Every structure is written in C-alpha cells, then in structure tokens.
Scaffold this active site. Structure first.
Site, PDB file in Angstrom:
ATOM      1  N   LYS F 162      34.157  37.754  31.051  1.00 30.79           N
ATOM      2  CA  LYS F 162      34.984  37.892  30.046  1.00 30.79           C
ATOM      3  C   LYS F 162      36.330  37.054  30.356  1.00 30.79           C
ATOM      4  N   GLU F 188      41.271  49.945  38.876  1.00 30.65           N
ATOM      5  CA  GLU F 188      40.153  48.835  39.026  1.00 30.65           C
ATOM      6  C   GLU F 188      39.933  48.213  40.521  1.00 30.65           C
ATOM      7  N   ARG F 189      38.564  47.888  40.583  1.00 33.45           N
ATOM      8  CA  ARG F 189      38.357  47.213  41.811  1.00 33.45           C
ATOM      9  C   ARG F 189      39.190  46.024  42.032  1.00 33.45           C
TER      10      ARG F 189
END
Ligand SMILES: Nc1ncnc2c1ncn2[C@@H]1O[C@H](COP(=O)(O)OP(=O)(O)OP(=O)(O)O)[C@@H](O)[C@H]1O
Ligand SMILES: Nc1ncnc2c1ncn2[C@@H]1O[C@H](COP(=O)(O)OP(=O)(O)O)[C@@H](O)[C@H]1O
Lengths: 466, 51, 510, 160, 51, 309, 71, 73
Positions: F162, F188-189
C-alpha cells in the site's frame, strides 16, 4: 359513591415517573388495591395501590398522565378499594376503562358493583361436557374438534393476519351465533375499532353485547387494569347467563405492561427481562378463565407471539396454560397461501378417535403421515433435486403439493380482501375429500385447480374448465 | 447567473456606503434608547464618542 | 437605511418596558452533571416534566424528582459550564412555536434557527405530548394519493393517514428512495415534512440543492437533523416535530410527513437508558418503543366533522380533519424479525419492502413484489384504477411464482411461456426511470396496455420500449379530450368504448 | 451527605425534643456534639476502630459529659447505627427543625440578609422592607439591580 | 438567480441585523456610561420606593 | 491549558492505576476537557477528563505511568484546554503525542497553539459545489471517480505494498497540487514504521508531511486522544484554506479503545461491549471530515477487519 | 435502611436504655405479597412455622440480622 | 498476597519497603537455577548478579532499531 368526605391526604413524596411516591397518615391504610382520589389541577386522579411501603408513603399506580404535577400534593381516598358497576344494561353502549360510557350515550347502567378480585370454583363446582362445534373452517373445524365452552388459542405475532386472521375469527365467530356472547379489544387499533363500530351499527347487533375497547396508545395503568375489567365483566354474565363466549387481544401487551412495570417497582426482572411474578400473573389470568356447573363460557384468545421464539417463556406459559391453540406458518403464509396456519403444528386435545370414530382419526393420521413424508424427503430433494425420485415417492410428492394446494377454499365474507367470494362448508363433503384424496381418486386432477378451490364437484367444474 | 451576480456584489457595496453612513443614525437611536431605557434620569451631556 | 425603520420598531417593542419577580423563586443549585444530567437542587414543586431555562437559554429535561433532589438532561452544548449554578426554569415545558404562518423554512429542529433566515412568525408555543383523538370521531378518507411511480401506484392505493411502511436498505437508494415523490404532489393540497436522522451534511445539502430545483420548496417544510444532534434533539426530535401538523390537522386539514431511520432513536434513547442505568432488553432495548411508538405511531388521523367543530372550537364548524405521513424501515442485512422492526411492523397498517436483486440487478424499481403490502388497500382506487387494474397484484406473484419454474424444457406452452414472457416484458414495461414523474394519463395508458392486450403480444422487448414511447407520444396529437377524462374519475363504459376505438387506432402507429 | 437519612433520626429528634422539651437543652447537646465531631485529630481516630462500645465509651469519655441518658442510649443508637460519623448534618436539619416551628429569616436583596423573624410572606417581609430605614446601605445593591434590570434589558436586546 | 437575489436580501439584511446587534452591544457599553453618568443614590431610593 | 501561574494543588484522593481520584479547591474546577498538570518526581503529569464528582475531587486519567504515587498530591490546574503548538514547519518533522519532537528531534519550532477540542461544524459553511478529487489513477480514478474532501474506504492488505499506493499519492499531491497532507499510524508494529521512515528517505518526499505515530506501545488515553490532534493539525491546512486528505489507521483499534475506556469508565458498555456511546465518537470522527467552503478534507482509512463479520 | 422505625426510635430513643422483653409474637413491619419484614418473637428456631391472623402459619429460612420477614 | 498467606493474622502493624520490584540484575549469575521470587532455587547457596532490578519497563524508540539478518538455527 357515597361521600367519601374529607380523608385528608398523603402528600406527594417523590416524583418517580408514573410510580406514585407519596405519604399519608399513620392510620391511613389501604388494601393491596384500594380507593384513592386526587384532583389534578384539571381533575380527580387516582393511583392504584402500592404493595406496602411505610411512612403513610407507599407507592401506587395510574392510568393517567404524570406530567405537570407538583410535589407534596395532598391526595384523597375513596372507601371502596375498587367498585365496578355490574349491569346487564351494558350491552347497549361501551364504556371507558373507568366504565365511563364509551358510546356517546350516557348510560345509567346499574348500581350493582364489582371489584377486580374474583375467585375460582371448587373442585366439584364446574361442569365438564363434550358438546362441540363444527363450521366452515376448511381444516381446523375439520382438522380439529371444538368442544363447547372451549377457549380457543391464537398463535403468533401479528402481521400473520393476526388481525386479519383474527378477522377470520370474526367471520366464523360472526358466522355462527345461536346465543349471547361478548368480546372486546384493548391496546388496539382504531381503524379496525371504528370500523367494527360502524359495521357494528350496520350489523346493529350491539344490543346483544357491548364491549369497552382499549386503545393502543393508552396509558399503561389502564392497560394493567383491563383484565379486572374482563373478570368483573364476566362475573355478572356468568351469574347472569349460564353461557358466554368472547375473544382476547394483545395479551402480549398484558405481559408487556406487566414486565414493563416490574423493575419500575424496584424489582429485578424475570429472565429475558421478564417480570418475576409474570407466571404468577398468568396463572392469575388464565385462572380467571372458568366455566361452571351453574354456567359455562367460551372465548378464544390472542397474545402477540413475540417474534416466533417458541422458547419464549411467555409462549411457555402459553402452552402450559394453553387450552386450545392454533399456529401459522410464515412459510405457508410466505407460500402465498391465503389460509396460512401451521397445520402440522396445531392439535386438538379433544380430538379423540373414539369421539372422532376411526375414519377421522385414521385419515387425519394418514395426512399427517404424508406431511411427515414430504417434510421427510424435502431435504433429499433440495439436496439432489428430484432427479432420483423413487417412483412411489415421486407419486406421493405429487399428492403432496396437491394436498397442501388442496386445503384451500374461498370464504363468503372474504371477498373484501380478494374480491372473490366463498362459501360455508359441509363436513360430510369434507369426509368425501378424505377418501378421494386418500384415493387420489381423481388421477388427472389439476394441481393449480385445487388451491383456494371448491368441492370435488366444484373443483370438478374447474376441472372442466380448469 | 454570473451577470446577475456582479450587480449583486455592487448592491452590496453601495449598501456598505449607506451602512457606514447610517452609522450616524444608529448612534443617534442608540443614545435615545439609552435614555429611554435608563428609565431613570436624562443627562445628554456626556459624549460616548463611539464609532 | 431602510432597516432604520426596523430599529424604530424594535424600539417600540423595546417600549414594552419592564417588571420583576421571583427574587428567590424556585432556583437552587445544579449539583453535578455528567453530559446534561445533573444532581440538581432547588425548585421542588414544579409541574412534572417542566422545561428549565439554562445558560445560552437552554431548557432542561428532568424526568426524575427524587424525594430529595432531582436531575435533568440538557440539550445543546454539554460542556458549557461549571456545576452548582443557580437554576433558571421555563414556565411551560414543551413550549414550541405554533401557527402554520411560517412555512417551507430551515430551522434548527429543536431551535427555530437555521440558514439563512432565522426570522419567522410563530402563533405560539406548542407541546409534543398529545392524547389520542376520539376514535369515535374519525373520517374514513377516500382521498387517493398519487405515486408518480408507474406501477407502484398500482401496487397500492393511498388514502390519508394510513400507517405507511416503507422498508429501507443500506446503499439502496433507500436514502434516495422515492422521497422525491413530493414532486408527484406538485399541487399538494396538504403539507408534508420529512425527517432525517443524524443526517449527513452533504445529503441535506444536496436535498437543499435540488430542493427548489423541483420547485417550490416553501410549499411544505421540514426540520434540521444532524449526526451531532443530541438525543435531546436526537432521540427526542421526531417526537418533537409532531405537534406541528396540529396546524393544519388541527386546522382540520390533512397534512403529511416522512420520517425514518428511527432506529437511530433507539440506541440514542438507549444511551439514554444507560443513563437510566435501567436494564435494557434485547438490542439494548426498553419497551419505550411502544410508548415511544405509541407516542410516535399514534399520530395520524382523519376525523369527524363535528369532531372538528370541537377541534375548530366550532370555528371551522366541523371540517373533517385528516393527517398524512410517511415512514420507512432500514434494513441492516435484510433480516425479517429484526426485533424492533418486528415490533413496528406489528404497529404498521401497511408494508413496503425492497428487493435487493432488482436494483442490485440494476433494475430501476427494486421494491419487494408482494414481500410487502398496505393492509389498508385500494379503497381509493379510481374505478378505472380500481376497476381495470386488478390482475397484477395477484398475477405478479404468478409470474414470480411462474419465475419459480426453474427453466425446464418447453412445456405448458403459452400457459408457461406466454405467462412468463408477458410477465417479464410486463416488468420491463413497468420499470420507471429515476426522476421521472408519472402521469394520471400515463395510468390510462398503463391500464390500457392490456385492457385486453390490444398490444399485448404485438412487439418485442426492445420493441416494447420503443413502441411504448411511440404510444405515449402518438396520443397527445391523437387526443386532447383526455384532459376531461384526466380531469374525470373515469371508468365509463362509454369512455371504455371511445378508448376502444382510440385503442386499436394506434395501429397506425409503429 | 445522605442527610436525607437524617429524618428518622432527625425526626424523632424534634419529637423527643418536643417530648423532652429539651430544645434549649437538646440544642445544647447538639452544639456540644457537632463540636465534638469537628475534632480532626480525633477524626482520624474516629473511623479508626471497629468496636462500637469502644467509641461510645471513648467518645462519650473525653466528651466533657454534656451527655444525656436519652442521648446515651440514643447516641448508642447512632453508633449502633454506625452511621453516626456524619451526624452534624442533622443540626442543620435540627436548625430547620427548630426553625420549622415558628421562625423566619431573610435573603439579602442585593446587599445583606436580615434573617428577620417575620412569618408573613410578603407581609412580615413587607414589614421588613418598609422597615428600611435600613434603606441606607448600598452593599453592591446598585450594581446588582441596575445590572440585573440591565440583564433583563440586554436580554431584551437579544430579544430585539 | 432571482432566488439568489432574495437570499442576498436575506443575508444582507441579516448583516444589517448583526451590525444592529453588535451596535446593540456598543450601545450597552455606552449604557455602562449612562450608569457612569447621572447615577444618584436618589435613583436607588426610587428603586427602594418600588418596594 | 492555563495561561499559567499558580494553578494549585488538590490532593490525590483514591488511586487505582489510571483511575485518578483527586480533589481541587472547593470553589471551582476546569472542564473535563480542561486539564491540569502535576510534577511527580521527574515530571509533571496531567490527567484527562475528571468527569463530575465531589469535593473538588472528580474522576480523571492519563496515558502516562502511575508509579510512585503519593496520597496528598498537588496539581497545577491548566485552564484553556489542549492548546497545542503546531506550525507549518511540522511537515517532514515528527513530534510525540505531546508535540514532543519524538524522533531525533527536528527541534520543530511552532507558532501555532490551539486546542484540538475545536469543533468543526458550521451550518451552510462549506461550499455547495461538490467537486470531485482528480487522482490521475488509470483505474482507481478512471475506473472510479474521487470527490474533493471525500471520505474513502480501504480494502486491500498485507502484501499490497500500500505504501506504493501512498507514494503514488505523494507524487500525486505535490505533482497534482500544492495541497499537501499527512497521516499518522497508531497502534502498530514499529518496524513497519521505521522502515517507512527509511522508506521516506528513499521516497525522499517525506518533507511535505509528517506525523507522530502510535505504534501500540502506548497507553490508550493517549491513543484515543490522538484523533483530535490530527483534527487540529490538518485544521491548520484546511484552516490554511489549503485542502487535503490523510490516511487513517485501524478504527476497531480506535473504537475498541473506546470500550477499554468504558470499562475504564466503569460505564455499562454498549452491546457486544461497544462503547455505549461509541457511535457518538464516530460522530466526532466521520463528522470531522469536510471539504470546507475554503478548504477540502478528504481521507482514507483502513480499520481492523474483524473476522469480516 | 433496616432501621427505618424512627417512631419506635422515639420509643428506642430512651428505650435503647431498656428493652429485655422477648415476645413469642412480634409485629410484622411491612409485607410484600405474603412476605413481610417483621420483628418480634425474640427466640428463633430455624424454619419454624409461625401462626398468623387466621389459621395460617408461615416460615422464613434466612436468619436475618436484627429483623426478618417471611411468606 | 505474597508467599504463604495462610499462616498470617491481622492487626500485624505494617512493614514498608520503599523499593519495589527490585531483583539483582547482572550477568554474574548466569545458568543458575532460580525460583520465581528468587534465584535461590539453585542448590547453589549464593548467586552473583550486579543488583536489584525492577519490573516496570519502557520500550525504546521505534526509531532506533537494528534490522537483523541473523539467521537462526
Ligand atoms: N432502482 C434505481 N433506479 C434509479 N436510481 C436508483 C435506484 N436505486 C438506487 N438508486 C440511486 O441511488 C442513489 C442514492 O441512493 P441512496 O443514497 O439512497 O442509497 P441509500 O439509500 O443512501 O443507502 P440507503 O439505501 O442505505 O439509504 C440515488 O441516485 C438513486 O437514484
Ligand atoms: N386468508 C388470508 N388471505 C390473505 N391474506 C390474509 C388472510 N388472513 C390474513 N391475511 C392478511 O393479513 C394481513 C395483515 O393484516 P393483520 O391481520 O393486521 O395482520 P396481523 O394482525 O397478523 O398484523 C392483511 O393484509 C391480510 O390480507
């Protein structure tokens, strides 16, 4: 009636909604239902009793509108904890829940009064009899026997035609009278109501009976009260007439109000948020039903089935307390079938083969077998289609769609909904149908023909053209 | 539509002229109401000196 | 400039002078609120349910007066201020502008104000609470209404006041729907509002854009309802807007309104119940629905004359009142029971349902064919409409039922094929384009199409369309006189003949 | 500050107070008590202990013996109640209690509150109003009534 | 376009009303001077008289 | 929040973790949105909305850490809430939730300070024009149009790259227009993040846009809070009369955070345990986006897809 | 709460001093639907039937501190 | 609760440790057997770690990281 002078008051203690929190003298004491007056700015209002709370403060109930009230308000009381005038003059004009003449006619009615509380016969007191009734009901009269005095059950939520299927109930009910009976409706719609009024006028039958009719948007306190209206209502008649018949509405609403108020009482609900005593309330209401040696009574009854959850403990108390009952198939409905009842479902305790002879019991059993079968393979088809159909099976299946299709017939009064008229039906003719169908006697018979159809002669005339 | 529009803007502007102009009339009226409203005592001498 | 006069007037109103009262009065100090609801002190005796003035002139919703203190629920800004302030309170709860004089205007739903003109005229305050009109006094109403959707009108007739179900479905054109149908009423003869729950700016905006596009938006009005709107405004609002129709309805005039997406009101009112802290039912639900619904649903009527003489206070001397309106029913995931929608459905007098396939199939109409219906029925159907128009209602199912056939080998011949084709083609025929108003004349044309089938088999599908367009056209040239007929109620055997000659007459056409 | 809880306690008060006719005396008792309650180093200690007897005794003990037997058995009620912690509130109630019978006070109009004992609303009140002659004092009144009339006024400006 | 013109009447008129309202504010400030001017304990005594 | 001198103390009343019971002066307290800070050992600490409770004590919370408590405790009350110093310099510069120039600090001077609590409705305000956004996307845009200031849903996922889409957007914003927007990851990671920073260097375009990122290492009060930030920040550029669109993170992360709050709230959750008002929050969110009369705010979001229920 | 008497508080006001009277029969303060908060019959036997107005006797299982009720 | 709750009884006064969560940190003790609360589970009598270390923890800046190509067996 008699003063009812003075009595001073509770002052309004606390405003909890319609819940009545107010406080009276130490000596001031009610029954678990007792007679209290108070004038709103507009008018005398009354809050039915409290259970038991202290400080001259107990709770209480109302059929009225709570808003626009000032706290601490003094509150009056009437002697007669409940007083319900009992006339036979009533059959002319309907009345409020207060019994205030609902027709425009003012009615002196009668002095004899009643109260909510009523009680059941002794073990030996009632009479038990097998007299039964049969009518244009294609099946159910056929499919099931109906003893005299019997309380017929209505199954379902509405939309089922429950008002329109109920309208069938009107019809057959309307169809046969040969006596005096009365029914009413409450928490219910007017278009129907006013219509039954105009048509009642046209009918001009009102002499035979009047019924106060409760309105859907009505305040709960009334709604709760309405049962007592029922019981007292009967009481005169049961005394008065030995015999009676009626019908019952929106008892779902009965449950509904009742639960609704339960926690309002500061109670924890019965399950599914039911009301904890709700069953007790039910054994109360069904218990209210009776037919005695001295007199017996018939009526048929309806509560909206909430949502076709059969597990509904409401539905439990249904079958539990159930006397007679019927069921409807929203597939069968969905089948576009006009009659739309769950035939496989419904059952007559009274049905006895000995009573019915064998031919009835037998034949009915057989159809039941067919149903079992078509239900039975219905799977296998749906899976496989019919491609593999065992000959015999295949044949039966023909008989099946045919037989379902077969049940349906027209009704005279029915021309309203569908312009098509119909007719009363004759049992013996039915018995014939049992054989010929059992025979499958007409081998070439048209399937489409059979639906909403006339007799084997009539369907034979169709058969000629159709 | 545009054509109507331009003239519209104009009407706005001239209006603005009549506006700053009317500011006089307003100061007047407001004073007047201040007396009437005071509903107490009439002293016209003080100069608020307000736009 | 010109308004300087207005300044003068305002000076005259301002000349109303002054007085004072209530040096203590009720007052009291609002102890602590979460989100509109406050431990609150003072003002013990008020008429139950009173509205209570607040900063930025806010009335307060207080349902509960404890024996000791009470608590209330604000509309408007929750966070405005710090707690413990003295209490300001409105004389009358439920006081809202009355008279119908102002019309077709953008207000706050709750407030009067909205773009662009706040200034408006109100005959007086009004209250949403009401008692049922006398069932005794009701006018069964034959006033037909007019779909402007080709076959839809056919599917069901419209008298004034029927509980009017639409289904509704996500992304379905449901927000679209036919709500346009007000254009079908170009000459309204009754005023309508519509209600839009927590509605989207762009939506409201576009409606606005189109709003005069069709023409006079003023003709009727509706109230502003947005996502931010608080269950005061939000849960409370459709209820709020009700008493309005008591202008014409209470003027004894029929009036119509649309509202839907009421589901919003439920968890709206449920978040309310979390406040109530009361245990909800399934789907966070209380039974208030009924009450709510009863409150809500109970509104529409058409009434007896002398009833109005009362309602008129004899002024209108018994002019039969009516009321009209429209609902619609969201489909989350097209589930029948849908609990509450079960409940409502129970309430409903009539039913509309949509067919996912059709518009999903792209079909211009998607309405669910016999999945739903109006229990009221065709009482008002023109003896032409009434008379000629029957077969579809049933026969449609047939073709659909016949559609059930699952495409076996050539069989029954025309019984099968003819019926089905006739059906399918008939459907194509029936299809009405978006933004296309139907004509009463069209109805004629419609009903005429097969009175018999003078054209029934004539043409193919494409040819059906083409030829059909041809049909409608050729007539205008062909006849003016229909205007009378159009003006007329119709169903004259003689008319039927003139129609018959005219009827084959189109053979000249193509 | 349940304080509503006061009543059954508070109520029997006036009655006992009525019956006992102590209200001079009982009033004394209350004064004394709220005093006792106030004691903060004591207060820390005050919720310290479980044994109710221990507190009835110790509390009653350092008390300086303003106590009454009816107030001993009864104090024993409040401790037995265990609710006693909040007791002083009742005095406020008791005030109203005492007040209730025949009393009156006053809300400052714009200045300071006479608290006059005038039992005729707008009359005995009016009697005080006229009684000014206290008409002297400003005490923010002018800013208040001018600003409040001014408040109704700008209120009408808004209305304008 | 005509409609728009109407709207302009509405909005322009409205701004006039805003200038009118702000105008009202400044008027009120001057009224604070109308208190600053011609303020007498006697006037208060009149209020007292309003008893 | 305060124009700050003094701002007082209170005491720390009852504390379980983030649950902040504490009491201010008897007289008054600032709004729940309004907030106050107390230096605890190393640092000042500010707790979130108190909601309403008594004795100057009321119920509050913070994303920061609660260790090292003290019964008596004193917080200087901040007043005008949430004022925050954004500046256009932010683009290509990264700060913490606090605006703390989280990364290797770009030192990030900022002249703007505003509460993110700012509402952004206005009746009739935005333009009536309904412009479409023109992407130059051979299929995305051509195959399907794009509206100015419009909300945009995301399906796609891991292995979609993305970011490739995003970079496409980067060339697309500048290339297409002066208007420039930034999005921020939360919950988030981390590796993805830093890699995306490197990927910004590789991209090299990072300058035009910048953001603090949540990375899910953090406490919720922060997390749920973050939204209002970006709200205000772009509210610089749409407020700049500039117009733009930002990407958005897993909502279910967000709303769910709503519930964790509600349990935290001790309040009865919505059904299926949603935030009993969670819809309301959505009101905040979806309600936020608009193409103003003078600005356009579009965006796209990917929410945690929960079992595809 | 359970105390609630207030009038007997008047009683107990000084009668907190003196009680020492164990009835077999105490007054039944308040009832709901056959079950009543009640006080008296100082001696307790768990699950003892308890005679009533009219022949009826009742029982309560729960040992309830300082007061108890039954149906 | 910490340890063998059952024995104890109340009104025990109170015993306060400023420290919390501190367990000897160090590489000294490696490979030893350890109870949960303590190393002591080792048959080894003492154990050498540099000094008490606390449970609360703060992760480092995501910014600062090493991508790692270390394969693993
Ligand atoms: N059968 C149809 N013929 C023409 N237009 C249609 C049809 N079905 C839907 N539409 C179009 O859908 C567009 C918007 O529909 P709408 O926005 O109402 O979907 P929606 O109804 O908002 O979602 P929901 O159905 O949940 O409200 C309108 O342009 C309307 O014309
Ligand atoms: N035998 C029947 N054939 C066709 N429709 C029926 C029949 N019985 C009932 N209905 C339908 O039931 C519909 C619902 O009317 P109503 O009775 O109110 O349903 P309900 O009471 O179950 O809500 C009516 O429109 C009527 O057409």
């Amino acid at each position: 009636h008699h003063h009812h002078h003075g009595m001073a008051t509770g002052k309004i203690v606390q405003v909890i909604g319609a819940v009545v929190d107010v406080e009276f003298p130490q000596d001031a004491v009610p029954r678990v239902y007792d007679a209290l007056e108070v004038q709103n700015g507009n008018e005398r209002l009354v809050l039915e009793v409290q259970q038991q709370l202290g400080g001259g403060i107990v709770r209480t109930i109302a059929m009225g509108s709570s808003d626009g009230l000032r706290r601490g308000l003094d509150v009056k009381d009437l002697e007669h904890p409940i007083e319900v005038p009992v006339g036979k003059a009533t059959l002319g004009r309907i009345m409020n829940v207060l019994g205030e003449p609902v027709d425009m006619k003012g009615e002196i009615g009668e002095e004899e009064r009643w109260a909510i509380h009523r009680a059941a016969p002794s073990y030996e007191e009632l009479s038990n009899s097998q007299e039964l009734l049969e009518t244009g009901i294609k099946v159910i009269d056929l499919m099931a026997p109906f003893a005299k005095g019997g309380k017929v059950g209505l199954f379902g939520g509405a939309g089922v035609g429950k008002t329109v299927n109920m309208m069938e109930l009107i019809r057959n009910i309307a169809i046969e009278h040969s006596g005096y009976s009365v029914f009413a409706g409450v928490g219910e719609r007017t278009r129907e109501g006013n219509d039954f009024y105009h048509e009642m006028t046209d009918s001009n039958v009102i002499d035979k009976v009047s019924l106060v009719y409760g309105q859907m948007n009505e305040p709960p306190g009334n709604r709760l009260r309405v049962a007592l209206t029922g019981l007292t209502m009967a009481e005169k008649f049961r005394d008065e007439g030995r015999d009676v018949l009626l019908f019952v509405d929106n008892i779902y609403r009965y449950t509904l109000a009742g639960t609704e108020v339960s926690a309002l009482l500061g109670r924890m609900p019965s399950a599914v948020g039911y009301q904890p005593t709700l069953a007790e309330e039910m054994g109360v209401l069904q218990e209210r039903i009776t037919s005695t040696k001295t007199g017996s009574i018939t009526s048929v009854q309806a509560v909206y089935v909430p949502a076709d959850d059969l597990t509904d403990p409401s539905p439990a108390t249904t079958f539990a307390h159930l006397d007679a009952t019927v069921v409807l198939s929203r597939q069968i409905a969905s089948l576009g079938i006009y009659p739309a009842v769950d035939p496989l479902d419904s059952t007559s305790r009274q049905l006895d083969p000995l009573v019915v002879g064998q031919e009835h019991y037998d034949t009915a059993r057989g159809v039941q077998s067919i149903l079992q079968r078509y239900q039975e393979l219905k799977d296998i088809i749906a899976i496989l289609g019919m491609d593999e159909l065992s000959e015999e099976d295949k044949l039966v299946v023909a008989r099946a769609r045919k037989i379902q299709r077969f049940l349906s017939q027209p009704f005279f009064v029915a021309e309203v909904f569908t312009g098509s008229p119909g007719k009363y039906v004759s049992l013996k003719d039915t018995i014939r149908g049992f054989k010929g169908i059992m025979e499958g006697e007409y081998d070439h018979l048209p399937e489409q023909a059979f639906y909403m159809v006339g007799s084997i002669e009539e369907a034979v005339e169709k058969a000629k053209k159709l | 539509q545009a054509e109507i529009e331009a003239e519209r803007k104009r009407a706005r502007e001239e209006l603005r002229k009549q506006v700053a102009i009317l500011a006089v009339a307003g100061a007047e009226k407001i004073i007047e109401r201040s007396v009437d409203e005071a509903a107490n005592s009439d002293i016209v001498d003080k100069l608020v000196a307000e736009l | 400039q010109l308004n300087s006069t207005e300044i003068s007037e305002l000076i005259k109103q301002r000349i109303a002078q002054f007085n004072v009262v209530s040096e203590a009065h009720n007052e009291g100090t609002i102890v602590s609120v979460s989100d509109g609801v406050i431990r609150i002190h003072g003002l013990a005796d008020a008429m139950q349910g009173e509205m209570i003035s607040l900063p930025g002139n806010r009335y307060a919703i207080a349902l509960n007066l404890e024996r000791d203190s009470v608590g209330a629920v604000v509309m408007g800004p929750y966070a405005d201020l710090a707690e413990g302030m003295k209490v300001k309170a409105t004389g009358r709860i439920l006081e809202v502008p009355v008279g119908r004089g102002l019309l077709g205007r953008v207000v706050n739903t709750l407030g009067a104000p909205i773009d662009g003109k706040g200034p408006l005229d109100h005959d007086g305050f009004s209250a949403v609470e009401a008692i049922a009109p006398g069932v005794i006094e009701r006018q069964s109403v034959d006033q037909p209404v007019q779909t402007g959707y080709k076959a839809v009108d056919s599917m069901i007739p419209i008298g004034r006041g029927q509980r009017e179900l639409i289904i509704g479905d996500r992304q379905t054109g449901k927000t679209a729907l036919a709500i346009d149908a007000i254009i079908n009423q170009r000459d309204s003869g009754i005023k309508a509002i519509y209600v839009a729950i927590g509605q989207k700016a762009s939506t409201i905006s576009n409606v606005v854009r189109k709003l005069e596009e069709h023409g006079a938006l003023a003709n009727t009005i509706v109230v502003v309802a947005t996502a931010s709107e608080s269950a005061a405004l939000q849960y409370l609002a459709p209820y709020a807007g009700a008493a309005m129709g008591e202008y014409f309805r209470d003027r004894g005039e029929d009036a119509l309104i649309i509202y839907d997406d009421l589901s919003k009101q439920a968890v709206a009112y449920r978040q309310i119940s979390l406040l109530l802290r009361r245990p909800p039912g399934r789907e966070a639900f209380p039974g208030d629905v009924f009450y709510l619904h009863s409150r809500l649903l109970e509104r529409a009527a058409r009434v007896n004359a002398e009833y109005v003489e009362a309602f008129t206070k004899g002024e209108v001397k018994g002019k039969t009142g009516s009321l009209t309106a429209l609902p619609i029913i969201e489909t989350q995931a097209g589930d029948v029971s849908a609990f509450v929608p079960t409940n409502v459905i129970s309430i409903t007098d009539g039913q509309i349902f949509l067919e996912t396939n059709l518009f999903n199939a792209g079909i211009r109409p998607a309405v669910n064919p016999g999945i739903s219906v109006s229990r009221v029925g065709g009482a008002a159907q023109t003896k032409i409409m009434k008379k000629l128009s029957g077969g579809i209602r049933t026969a449609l199912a047939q073709y659909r039922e016949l559609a059930a056939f699952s495409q076996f080998a050539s069989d029954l011949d025309d019984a099968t094929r003819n019926q089905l084709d006739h059906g399918q083609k008939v459907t194509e025929l029936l299809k009405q384009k978006q933004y296309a108003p139907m004509s009463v004349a069209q109805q004629s044309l419609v009903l005429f199409a097969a009175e018999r089938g003078y054209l029934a088999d004539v043409e193919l599908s494409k040819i059906g369309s083409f030829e059909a367009a041809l049909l409608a056209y050729v007539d205008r040239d062909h006849a003016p006189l229909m205007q009378e007929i159009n003006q007329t109620g119709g169903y004259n055997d003689e008319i039927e003949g003139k129609l018959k000659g005219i009827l084959d007459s189109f053979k000249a056409t193509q | 500050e349940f304080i509503t809880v006061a009543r059954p306690y508070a109520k029997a008060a006036f009655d006992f107070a009525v019956e006992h006719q102590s209200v001079e005396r009982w009033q004394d008792m209350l004064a004394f008590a709220a005093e006792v309650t106030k004691n903060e180093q004591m207060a820390e200690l005050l919720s310290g202990a479980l044994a109710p007897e221990t507190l009835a005794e110790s509390f009653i003990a350092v008390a300086g013996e303003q106590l009454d037997e009816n107030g001993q058995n009864l104090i024993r009620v409040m401790a037995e109640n265990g609710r006693l912690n909040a007791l002083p509130d009742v005095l406020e109630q008791f005030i109203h209690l005492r007040a209730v019978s025949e009393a009156t006070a006053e809300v400052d109009v714009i200045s300071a509150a006479a608290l006059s004992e005038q039992q005729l609303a707008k009359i005995s009140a009016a009697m005080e109003k006229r009684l000014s002659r206290k008409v002297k004092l400003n005490a923010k009144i002018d800013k208040s009534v001018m600003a409040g009339v001014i408040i109704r006024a700008g209120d009408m400006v808004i209305d304008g």
